[PDB]
Structure 1
């Protein structure tokens, strides 16, 4: 439906902003975790403070009113977090608000019930302790994956917004670790290579050669409800492919991907990136939230509350097993070969709601 479509466009707009902030470097975030976190924040906001968030998120208030957007994200969060057999998936977020400001009981229950949101009362006069509280909550929620989310914290800080995702899944076709090459050449520039181990399997994969956008798209299924999309642009075409990415593009690929026997070569690697979302969201329209003129009346009765920081970090491993620790010890040329040896874009999607669990660019897979 339309919400999936509107969230994917946000994902690619948010992605592009990151390409101007940090050009020619790795990008990695959970757009759905961000999109859901902002709506949640919005719930406690009033007037133009609230209005701005939903419009930066990509929604039109004439098309769909605020209550419908809430009920939609209500349903999206609930369906995602629903424990499905062979998949661990949790999209969550928290708030850390200065002890002197009392959040409303209605708001508290509403966000825990409808948005999977815990709200914490934190003392920000001890920026050291305050950091350790926050980081440990994300470290706890993500089962040790996302460590040390927040490095910097101003003495001013009044409210800190944190969003995250927990993801654990197996490949539908797991790789043979014995078939993994120890050191393969991987292009990052046009005049730099790095040694990345290269996993090797020949199996049936969905793929496409896009003649219009000048890239190869490969789909690798997880066993339950999730898939990876590897987008490999021809040389010099990385940025034009970045311009191309939209909801309209995915719909195209969904219609056109074909299954066949492929000699597949995929790098074994871990990617992580950490963001303070403020600089880009400020550019993208969310003003009044960070402002001294913030209206968060739905959240608290008493005065002086506003958003200090929105912080998010995404971590993902690509291994032989799936999204899990490897630690594993140690025929023909008439198959069409797909070899991911250059810098590529990467998408992790969830099937039933068409959400983007992860998006990013891998420029260099060795941190």
Structure 2
């Protein structure tokens, strides 16, 4: 329901804040749904404290939302996101690359295939370089070429890799006229430094507000169907304070306050990319037993034969006159327990 939506959004913002500490005053770009979806998939095969740590780290209180409801919710989420919508490209899916000597439970496999948009591939991790290339090429394909080289290094004793991918391509409800785009306009990257960017320009009715508490401008730009972009522009010197305030509660407040009116709007045309090594971050956030020799993934294989070793994410974004294209992928690596 929308209990889950509040929780997933708050996870996104808490992880965002961790990144503002890890990579201070740098571009940040990630898909929270990709990260959340991958971890919940892993949790399907987990038991006891290994399982509860994962879903509690994702933000869930097991009293409010029992393990089975969380499982149900995420299965329904993936289904809904993939349901075909005219004028919107949105796909989110998973791939499990399972070592050819592992003994996966039929129940774990049939479930993820049927209920969680998962393709399963028997993989020869005795050729680690070839396996790395196969997985990278699969992710590249599923992201329409946009996420290249997800996995830079794969441990020599890897026996399973779980990947989630997301690809999004949409047109603005009100596209920009490229004849009104300025080739080179200043964009302030710090107090005394500008870079030059193409600056798109149109005057249109947009939902917008000035948040009087948080001292920021909020501008909504709709895609033609089922999606929107929100731009949050803090007053000079106020980015840190706005970052501290971002939460599901803040989004709910803005949803009420946004009003449609004429705006003379200037938006840059640009692309960025980001990568995250998430292993240590997820450990710090509370996923501990998954990495340990007493990891409990008894729902995944007959012999409970694996443990988590590494995690990483890559995401890319392009914004231009026609719309937006964005993609991301999440990687979880397992080794013998």
Q: TM-score, normalised by structure 2?
A: 0.93
Aligned length: 331
* Greater Cα offset, 7-16 or 90-99: 90-99
1:319–1:325: 8 Å Cα contact kept in structure 2?
no
User: CA separation in 2, counterparts of 1:245 and 1:326?
Assistant: 23
Query: Which has the larger displacement, 265-274 or 156-165?
Result: 156-165
Q: Secondary structure at the match of 1:202?
A: strand
Deviates more, 1:22-31 or 1:112-121: 112-121
What does the per-residue CA deviation read over 1:15-48, in whole Å, with 9 as the maximum and x for residues that have no partner?
A: 1111111111111111112112111110011111
Distance verdict in 2 for CA 1:30–1:62, change over 3 Å: same
For 1:164-208, what per-residue CA distance to the aligned partner results, in whole angstroms no more than 9, with x for missing partners? 211111100011011100000001111211011000111110111
Q: How far did 1:62 drift?
A: 1.2
Unaligned stretches of 5+ residues in structure 1: 328-356, 360-366
Offset of 1:278 from its aligned partner?
1.3
The CA deviation at 1:267 is 0.3
Shift in Å, 1:93: 2.1
Closer, same or farther: CA 300–129 of 1 in aligned 2, 3 Å: same
- The TM-score normalised by the length of structure 1 is 0.86
Give, in whole Å, the separation in 2 of the partners of 1:324 and 1:278.
27
- Deviation of 1:326 (Å): 17
SS of corresponding position for 2:324: coil
Output the CA distance in 2 between the equivalents of 1:326 and 1:33. Answer: 10
- For 1:293, what is the secondary structure of its paired residue? coil
Determine the structure 2 residue equivalent to 1:173. 174
Q: Distance in 2 between matches of 1:105 and 1:358?
A: 23
Give the match for residue 151 of structure 1: 152
Q: CA deviation at 1:162?
A: 1.9
> Superposition pairs for residues 70-109 of structure 1, below 5 Å?
70-109=71-110
Q: Helix, strand or coil for the counterpart of 2:325? A: coil
Contact in 2 for aligned 1:162/1:310 (Cα 8 Å): no
Distance 1:90-1:152 versus aligned 2 partners, 3 A rule: same
Secondary structure (helix, strand or coil) at the match of 2:209 reads strand
CA gap of 1:358–1:107, structure 2 versus 1, over 3 A, is closer
How far does residue 114 in structure 1 lie from its aligned partner after superposition?
Answer: 1.0
Report if the CA contact (8 A) 2:9-2:248 is conserved: yes
Tell me how far 1:10 sits from its aligned partner. 0.3
After superposition, the Cα gap between the structure-2 partners of 1:128 and 1:118, relative to the gap in structure 1 and judged at 3 Å, is same
SS at match of 1:324: strand
Compared with structure 1, are the counterparts of its residues 314 and 272 closer, same or farther at alpha carbon in structure 2 (3 Å cutoff)?
Answer: same
Q: Deviations over 1:96-155 (max 9, x none)?
A: 333221212221110011111223332333332121011111011111111111112221
Provide the secondary structure at the position in 2 that maps to 1:298: coil
What is the SS of the residue equivalent to 1:101?
coil
Instruction: Give the distance between the partners of 1:80 and 1:276, measured in 2 at CA.
Output: 26
Question: Deviation per CA, 1:269-326, whole angstroms, max 9, x where unpaired?
Answer: 1121122321211110011112221111111103431122323221121011112599
Q: Tell me: CA distance 1:236–1:170, structure 2 relative to 1, closer, same or farther (3 Å).
A: same
Give the conservation status (yes or no) of the 8 Å contact 1:160–1:310: no
Please report the RMSD computed on the Cα atoms of aligned residues, expressed in angstroms: 3.4
Q: 1:157 Cα deviation (Å)? A: 2.5
**184-193 or 88-97, which moves further after superposition?**
88-97
| CA distance in 2: counterparts of 1:248 and 1:130, whole angstroms | 43
Q: Is 1:358–2:331 an aligned residue pair?
A: yes
What SS class does the counterpart of residue 51 from structure 1 fall into? helix
Report what 1:68 is aligned to. 69
Q: Shift of the alpha carbon at 1:358?
A: 17
Q: Is the 8 A contact 2:269 2:321 kept in 1?
A: yes
* Change in CA separation of 1:52 and 1:11 when aligned onto 2, cut-off 3 Å: same
Unaligned residue ranges in structure 2 (runs of 5+): none
- Once the two structures are superposed, what CA deviation does each residue of 1:37-77 show, in whole Å capped at 9, x if it has no partner? 11111001111111101100100111121111111111111
